[PDB]
Amino acid sequence: GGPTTAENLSKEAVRFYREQGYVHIPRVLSETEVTAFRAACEEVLEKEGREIWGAGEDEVQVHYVAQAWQKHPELRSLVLHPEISGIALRLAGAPLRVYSSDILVKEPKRTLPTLVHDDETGLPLNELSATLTAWIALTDVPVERGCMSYVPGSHLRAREDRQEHMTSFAEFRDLADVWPDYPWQPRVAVPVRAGDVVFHHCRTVHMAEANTSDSVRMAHGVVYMDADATYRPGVQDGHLSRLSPGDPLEGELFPLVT
């Protein structure tokens, strides 16, 4: 029945994360915090407008707002939430910074599944080691509301079985061509309640269901990068125009997790 905090997080949960590449941590945010953070995200959606992850209006996987935490004063306290970010730190076992966050919405009956990938491939960064994502549920997410699934142990893939980095979208390859054994790997669906968080490593292969429920799904994805991460040109780097290749990502836009 009780909250999970950075302090009371079990050694078993940390071991599960290190071995499996993901972990479900329940009850990190209270009902009150969920309500306040969801409302702030709704304000950002209204003010910024959403973007489509997918191939146009008829092939929406996810509606999103990128660098989302920067776009509302109250969202700083989400990405640097003491429990969420403190748990991320314990799981990673190394110093972290906030890279970015996204508002991640799936509308009911109008979404495709989120196509399988690892996050490393689309991060415009060098020097990744312990980088991981906190996928924070701001609504309940039973399976059919667009829940996440993960391939256990896939973060430990050898180099030849990983794509690593896309400089441009022409480099896209089907995961089965990159990782021939992909289709014979188990796939774990992890439904969650609002306020729960699932963390996954930047090499963990993952995906999400279509939302075929009657209710909107909203999560908030926070990418916590290695604290000494540097800039590497790639797809998804439009907001990093002020940087040169190899420059460290530091300062107020990429704050240290303490």
Ligand X SMILES: O=C(O)CCC(=O)C(=O)O
Determine contact, residues 74/220, Cβ cutoff 8 Å.
Answer: no
Nearest to Fe ion by Cβ — which residue?
Answer: 119
Give least dist CB 85 to Fe ion, A.
Answer: 19
Interface with ligand X (CB under 6 A), residue from 9, 13, 23, 62: 62
In this complex, which beta carbon is closest to Fe ion, that of residue 119 or of residue 209? Answer: 119
Interface with ligand X (CB under 6 A), residue from 41, 79, 104, 257: 104
- Residue whose C-alpha is closest to residue 206's, from 224, 194, 189: 189
Using only C-alpha atoms, what is the Rg of the chain?
17
| 119 near Fe ion (CB under 5 A) | yes
DSSP letters along 88-149, please? HHHHH-S-EEEEEEEEEEE-TTS-PPEEEE-SGGG--EE--SS-EEEEEESS-B-TTBT-EE
In this complex, which beta carbon is closest to Fe ion, that of residue 39 or of residue 189? Answer: 189
- Residue whose C-alpha is closest to residue 222's, from 135, 127, 112, 121: 135
In this complex, which beta carbon is closest to ligand X, that of residue 62 or of residue 125? Answer: 62
Choose the one of Fe ion, ligand X, none that binds residue 163, judging by a C-beta under 5 to 8 angstroms depending on kind: none
Give least dist CB 78 to ligand X, A.
Answer: 14
Mask 208-227, x = binds ligand X (CB under 6 A)?
Answer: x----------x-x------
Report 133-192 residues binding ligand X (CB under 6 A): 133, 135
Choose the one of ligand X, Fe ion, none that binds residue 234, judging by a C-beta under 5 to 8 angstroms depending on kind: none
Point out which residues bind ligand X (CB under 6 A): 62, 104, 114, 119, 133, 135, 206, 208, 219, 221
